[PDB]
């Protein structure tokens, strides 16, 4: 399937799978982290690019001890519903164990970095 490919692509980066039921536990052991929420790559082939970007965007803020989490299709909807994220691909941002916001949509790389600063600062 297409998503299975993406999922393996992310697993290879070492990112950890997470379910809504365990998110809080993961969060407590990752004060500075990011949760990637995805949709079916078939419906929107843009969900495939999101991952690669986020990877880069992260090392743009070394000040944090970033940890990446990924949710499958079902869990992404679960977690999303809990945070009001109804625009996938989405990325939940957490700093110091605190939810700062969500990066949704697709913007130029320069438009992304500044959007993050508005979340972690």
Largest sheet features: 5 strands, mixed
Query: How many independent structural domains?
Result: 1
Helix and strand element order: HEHEHEHEEH
CATH topology: Glutaredoxin
Rg over CA atoms: 13 Å
Q: Walk across the major sheet and give the strand order.
A: 1-3-2-4-5
The fraction of residues assigned to DSSP E strands is 15-25%
Going by CATH, the homologous superfamily would be Glutaredoxin
Do you know the CATH architecture? 3-Layer(aba) Sandwich
The coarse overall form would be: globular
- CATH class call: Alpha Beta
Number of strands: 5
* Number of helical elements: 5
The N- and C-terminal alpha carbons lie at a distance of: 39 Å
- Overall SS class: alpha/beta
Report the oligomer.
monomer
Helix content: 40-55%
Pfam families: HyaE
Protein name: Hydrogenase-1 operon protein hyaE
InterPro entries: NiFe-hyd_mat_HyaE (IPR010893), Thioredoxin-like_sf (IPR036249)
Family: Belongs to the HupG/HyaE family.
């Amino acid at each position: 399937t297409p998503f299975d490919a993406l999922w393996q692509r992310m697993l290879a980066r070492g990112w950890t799978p997470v379910s809504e039921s365990r998110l809080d536990d993961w969060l407590t052991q990752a004060p500075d982290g990011v949760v990637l929420l995805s949709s079916d790559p078939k419906r929107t082939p843009e969900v495939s690019d999101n991952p690669v970007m986020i990877g880069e965007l992260l090392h743009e803020f070394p000040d944090y001890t970033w940890q990446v989490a990924i949710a499958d299709l079902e869990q992404s909807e679960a977690i999303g519903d809990r945070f009001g994220a109804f625009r996938f691909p989405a990325t939940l941002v957490f700093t110091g164990g605190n939810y700062r916001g969500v990066l949704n949509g697709i913007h130029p790389w320069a438009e992304l970095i500044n959007l993050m600063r508005g979340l972690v600062e």
